[PDB]
Structure formats: structure tokens, C-alpha cells
Amino acid sequence: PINDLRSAIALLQRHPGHYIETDHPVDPNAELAGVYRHIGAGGTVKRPTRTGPAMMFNSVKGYPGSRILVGMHASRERAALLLGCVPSKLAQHVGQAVKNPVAPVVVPASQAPCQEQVFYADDPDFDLRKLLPAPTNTPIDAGPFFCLGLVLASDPEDTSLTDVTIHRLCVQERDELSMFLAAGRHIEVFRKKAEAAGKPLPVTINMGLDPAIYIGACFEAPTTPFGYNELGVAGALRQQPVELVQGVAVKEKAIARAEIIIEGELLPGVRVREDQHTNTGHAMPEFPGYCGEANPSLPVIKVKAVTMRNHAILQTLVGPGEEHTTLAGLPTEASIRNAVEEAIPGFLQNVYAHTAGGGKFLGILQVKKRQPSDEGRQGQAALIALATYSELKNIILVDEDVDIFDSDDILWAMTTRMQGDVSITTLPGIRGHQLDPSQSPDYSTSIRGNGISCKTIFDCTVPWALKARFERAPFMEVDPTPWAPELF
Amino acid sequence: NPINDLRSAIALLQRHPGHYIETDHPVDPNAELAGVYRHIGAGGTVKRPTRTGPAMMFNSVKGYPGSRILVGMHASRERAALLLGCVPSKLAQHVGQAVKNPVAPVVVPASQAPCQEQVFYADDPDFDLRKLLPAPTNTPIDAGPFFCLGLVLASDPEDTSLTDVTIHRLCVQERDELSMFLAAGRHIEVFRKKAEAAGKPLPVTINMGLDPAIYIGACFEAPTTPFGYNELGVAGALRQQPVELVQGVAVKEKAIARAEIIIEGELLPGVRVREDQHTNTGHAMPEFPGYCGEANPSLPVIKVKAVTMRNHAILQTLVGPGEEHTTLAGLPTEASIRNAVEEAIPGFLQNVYAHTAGGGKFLGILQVKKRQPSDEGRQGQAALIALATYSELKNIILVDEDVDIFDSDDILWAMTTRMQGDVSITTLPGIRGHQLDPSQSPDYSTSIRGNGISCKTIFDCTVPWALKARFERAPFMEVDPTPWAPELF
């Protein structure tokens, strides 16, 4: 079975094409990301690019004994393989585990591989910049970045309330990182509580994990006493609870079977400019495919210790490309699937949070009109999708005979099953997302501020009265394996 | 080493693994044949699952020992570019360059006509086209067995110096009869009217199994010269070797000397047939948009006089018509659109893709580069030129030079982050498009006055000139990734 990063790699090695290694040296500064751009970054990264194998870089220039791993989640086919289900049913699969979680468990340090090696910060030869090779994606980033930091944090007033989230961090000093916290998230509430009292907030950055943890943590989870409830998804996906170990130097727990763990605390009453040492004005590439701007006021994490297993694998991403599409798009598809199935049972067939929108901006809904009254319900499904995921932008509606994962087949529906003065409904002035650069008053007079957009529903479904005229050419059902065994 | 026929082209594909396979597993030419290749290489607008892949040779045909059927030869832009010696992105330019400097065909005696290694005359009472050629059916609801890549040669029955070569599809009707549609307004149709007026048939040759250069070049617009057969001049220019012609054996027309199979027949005047007379399925064939077409009620009949083929003749056709149609139709579409925009706006259009989702006809993708403030507003001009150039286009998408116009994911990305639905979308109602789009119906829109009329839409996904500094895609370091994974390159 799988219970950490390395056992997942073993499964990938039994399916050739999903994992490779290389011993040719590489620079973690921009060179690594530039290489994986051609191999497996995918997503919204500039062409040429493609989905490919997960990649391991064994020779890291300037970091002997370190190995960097990227693209673990940069493939919907790979992600379904890691959880054991069909790719088209992957969101439905994880959504089922969301509804029947398996709570994590605390285990002693003897069962925590993540603490085989310990490095305290108060040691005078400790330097976070020499201990870990944090890669940069572009030569214009704010600095070195960790992009897959599973952050654990508890309320300082009541430890029974926790939060499990994925963050990115920029290495600033030998013992400091900058970390943005989304306003409204529980951990940001926890941090403002501690900063209001002048106290730091202990946290753990857990990196190099079972893919089931990274994916499952992106879903919304209920709350239970001493919860860490986001981990319950991975517990249900593996039918084995996720094990936790007490931190070595902070009053917070950590993933026991993690590759690397940074223990630190959010400092009270201190901010930092994200690119203070590079002065590029930017932070790093964002999921829409453009370079985000450097945040001028970020809170600082003061590192206390770094614990890692022997021959620790540093896991991060590149792009963020298809990797971000997987981690954000599966929750997007799941919450839309639940909302529509609740409102219109048996109508929605599937949903794809398209990788062209990073799994956030573009939603493709596949419906099936079973009866005359289903005409008019496709627009209802699009309204439900927009209402469930406010950060969406455009919705495309197609029938069950369209493959929503094939963008050629989507454009085909836009071509032969659509009239621009009939099938296109615009919705101006709806709050969308700040990182879409076209959501600007400079782009449209109907946009009153940044992050507001026009939202468009493309109804490429066949009108119920005409479905007999739109049957695709019916080729005979055959098994092509005998005529070309090598292709199957 | 050079290419001058179908078999020399297959030899080139064998030197590039992935573009050609064979199978000895028996296959039924009725439906089963197309059903197999639908999974392997049909591509295009064929219903999923499908993809582009190798061209395929079926060496074992049920009930037809000694026959071998070939499909998918043009069912790939990469394969077509390799078959012509250029990169797939410049494929439309490479052919358009050869169109401007054609090499005229040359007539040769039967000594140099491999196509005439076998001859079957139709006056034999035991003659039967069904026993001779295993014409496949794409779907069980087709009007009948079909030939889909018949290169037809014909000449004016009055002024033989006026010639026309074209690509048609033919449905098998009798042991010696075929039904063949002709597009109104083309020379071979005008030739047939003159002949039918005088109560005289029109001699034609149906050339199948050709150099891909011939099939591809024949779809472009060619001039007219005395005894020219000018659409063949593109293939001659693409090979730097004139296409060889041979006088017919039973009819008054020449045939492709290097062809695999030749059907010599005549268009009988006065007689008409409906396509599905023997099947009554109401349909004819799967069309390029992806739906089954309706049977033609009145079709001119070709009465075959002789069938002519080389030893172990390969039967070439298509399936889908899928990506194979996209290649043959889209390359002319892109070329004429590119010529029109480069003339009107030099240096602006970077590339153009007759997207395979439109069958190479309905959807056009235009890649422009705004170089100066005056270029703002010219992107819509470029879309209007393409719409004016290819009236069967329905939608246009405009993208910048940093968008891969052949990557449908990348096209939807520009439509997601570089587009506002109430700013970037222009609808043009009431413009004639194409009859085979089923949404071009009054039942689909009150602004459509008749079949074949559509609303045409321009999606402007180009960054406004004033904002270009804010829409730079993330700049990843330029590297050569070969040393890190040589097995992938």
C-alpha cells in the first residue's frame, strides 16, 4: 500500500512513463523549472510544454546529497493512478472520501520517519539557504520558493481548533521565511489572535507527502475536537489514518511520514517585502499563467528547527501548470457536482475544471436532457456552478456525447452546436478573481474594480426538440486490440 | 528514395516509426473496418474515443483475399508535413509556395503506366465491381459501399483543351454502376451539362491510390492552360518531377499513370438515382462536421467501362472523414486566408489554423502580432478578411503570437484570461455558411432565414495594445532539456 511519498513513487515505477530520474546536474535557480517546462509542467505554462512524468533531480548544483522532485501531481492520469480510480471519476472518488473521513492519529516519534535527522536553528552554523535547495520558477521571482508546504496550525486560545492548508513560502534569511495567509482562513484568524496579544503562532510546514494528503487537504472539511480534519480525506482514501507526531521545537504537530518538516512560528508585529533581496517587483508565476506581483507586506516565519528523514526528498512544483490544476480543480469539480446533483438529480453527467483556467476560471459541464422538461435546465446548472464557485469565469455546457476532457471536442461543440446570438449569455459586474488580468476597468467599462469580470455561459447543448438531428456518426462498436495489440 | 506514388510514400513512413502499421487480422469492410480505425487514427470530428495515429494497411479483408485496404494516409498534420519535407506549422506555406510555381504533367505510354498492369473490361458478362474492389462502408447506416478518395479527371466534351481534376466520393450501386455527386459551378459539372444536352455521355477516369502530394495539391485553386490538368502542377512542383499521365484504355480521358486503381466510366445522360436506393437508410455518409449526411435524391450515374489496377493493388480511402478531411480541406483554407491577409496587412498575420474541430472549414484560428499602436483594430480586419475569403467559415478566434494555435488547451486559455464576453465577442447574423452545419437552421435561431445560413462570431482574444505590458506570460529560462532526459528527445 501507499502511506508516504516514497511508496507512491514505487507504484509509479510499476507504470512506465509516470516517473523518471536524472543525474545530470541542475541549478535550482531557474534552471530546474526551465527544464521541467519542456517535460511535464503543462497547464497554463507557455508552450512548448506537455504533461509528462514526475521528475527527480538527483544532482543539485550547490546542494550535495539533496534531491528535488517536481510534477508529482502534474497529471490527472497520474493522480487517479495514485488513488486507484478512473481519471474521469477522480473527483467523484475523492468526494466520496470527503463524506466518510478517517480521523488522523498521534503516534510516537519512533514511528515518525520525518525526525530521523534534526537541525535546530540556534546552532550558529545553521542556514536554511544551505540546508534546503528551494527552487525558483523564473529568473524574476522574489526569491527561492517552497510551493508545497502543508501548513498545520492551531488556535492559540483553544488548541482543539486546527487548520490544514497548503501555502507557498519565500526564503528570506538564514532562519526566516515569508508566508502569505489568505484573509478569512482559520490560520490567519489564529495569527491575528496571537499578534493581538503580542505572541507568536507556532506552525509546521510539512513537505514531501502522500499525494492523498495534498489532494485531500484542498477540500473543505467539517470540524471536530482536535480535528486536523482535512487529513481525514487521505485517511479515507487509504483506509489508514494519517499519523501525526509532536513537533521537536514548536507547540504544534507534524506529519509523521513526511520527507521534510520546517518548524517555526509566525512572528508578531513584523512585515517584510516579498522581493526585498531581488527587487524584481514580482513574486512568482500564478496559476493563470502570468507573473504575480510581489506582496509588499508579508508576515515572517521564524524557523526554530528543520527535521527530515535520511536522504530527504524535497518536493515542490513548477508552473504551477497542471500541478495546480489537479490540486485546485478536483475540489472545484466536487463542489459543483454536489450542488447540481442536489438540485437536479441525475442531470449532470460530469464536470471538468479545465486546465486552461488552472482548474478555477473555466468550468465545463456535461449534461444529459432525458425529458422535455430538461430543456432550460442546462442554464440552471450553469447558474448553480457559478453560485457554488464564485471564482469561476466562463461556463461551457455540452451533452453526454462530448468528451469534456478533449479540448478539440469542446471546440467542436462550440462550432456545430452553437449560435452566437442565441447560445451566449453574458453576466457583467460579477466578482471573480484578482489574478485574471483582463478583470480590469482598463479592459471593460462595465468593470468597476480589479477582480470584477463579465461572466459568460456558452450553451453548446442541443435544444431538446432537435436532438434527433444532432446524432454523431455512429461507428460500429469493436475492440481494436487484435488489429494493433501494441497500441493497447 | 524520391516519392512518385503511394508505395514510395509508404516506404518513407516506414523509416519514421509511428506513422504506418499493418495488420493481418481479418477485418470486415462492412462497418467493422471503419470501427477499428476510429479508435486508432480517424481523429477529427469523429465521436470519442478517437485520436490521430498511424496510417493503416489492412492486409486481410474478409471475403477479399488478395485485397488490401489503406486508410489514414492524410489523417495527421505531422504525417502530411513529413510526406512533403517541411515542418507542420509551415505546411500551408510550403504548399502555397509550390502552387505558385507548378510543374506541368506529362503523358507517357502504357509502358510506363503501372496503373495498367491489370485491366478488367466491363463488357465481360461475369464482370462485377463488388467482386473486384472491397469498397468499405463507414457506418452500418451508410447508403452503400463508398470510395472516398477518387481523383476524377475530365475534359470539356467540346473543347478538350479544357480540363478539370477534382476529388469526389462514389457509392457502389450495381455491378457496373456508381453514383457520384458533383458540385454545381465547377468545370466538370459544366462539362457534364453540355454532354447531357446533346444526349451524349461524358468520359471520366477515377484515380485512386496516389502520391499524397497529388491528393493534397489537387484541393488548391489552379489556373487553366491548354491541356493543362493544372491541379496536378502542385504535386509536380512538390516533387520537382512531373506527374505522369497515361491515355485511357476504354474511355476518352487520361489517367494517373502511377496510380494504384483506375475506374474508367461515363456519366450517363438523363438517368438519375437516389444514393440509398439499395439500403433505404435515408443517409449517405458521415460528413466532415461529424454527422451522417442525408442521401441525395437525384445523383448522376457513372457507368464503368473498365477497371484498371497494378499488381496487388492497394485500395486507398478515408475513415471519419476525421483528420484526413481536415488535412485535405484545411490546408487550402489556411493558404488562401494567409495570402489575403498578407496582401492587405503585410507582416501582421503570423499563422492560421483551419481547426480540426471545424473539419478544416468551419473554425478559423488566427495568430497576429501587434507591433505598433496602429495595429490595434487590425485584428478585426484580419477576421473580416478571412470570413470574406472563405465564406464557409463560421467562427474566428484571434490570438497573439505567444499562443500555440494548434493547442486547443492554449486556445481556451486565451479565451479565459484574454477575453471579456461583453467586450470581445462580435456576432454577425444572417450570413450564409454551410448546409452541413445542423445549427444553421431556422429552428435553431429566429435570425436564420434558411438552411445553410448562420450567425458568425468573432472571438477577439488578443491583448489590447495598451495593456500588452500586463499580459506577459511567465518567462521561464530557455534551456535544452535533452541531457536531463535524452529518451524523451
Author numbering:
A (entry chain B): 4 to 491
B (entry chain A): 3 to 491
Paper text:
Based on a literature survey and a preliminary activity screen of heterologously expressed potential para‐carboxylases, 3,4‐dihydroxybenzoic acid decarboxylases from Enterobacter cloacae (EcAroY) and Klebsiella pneumoniae (KpAroY, 89 % identical) were selected for further studies.2d, 13 Both enzymes belong to the UbiD family and are related to a ferulic acid decarboxylase (Fdc1), which has been shown to facilitate the (de)carboxylation of cinnamic acids in the presence of a recently discovered prenylated flavin (prFMN) cofactor. The AroY monomer consists of an N‐terminal prFMN‐binding domain (residues 1–339), an oligomerization domain (residues 340–475), and a C‐terminal α‐helix (residues 476–495). A comparison with the previously reported structures of the fungal Fdc1 and E. coli UbiD14 shows that AroY structures adopt an “open” conformation, where the position of the prFMN domain is more akin to that observed for UbiD, compared to the more closed conformation observed for Fdc1. Crystal structures and in vitro reconstitution data unambiguously demonstrate that prFMN is employed as a cofactor, and that oxidative maturation is required for activity.
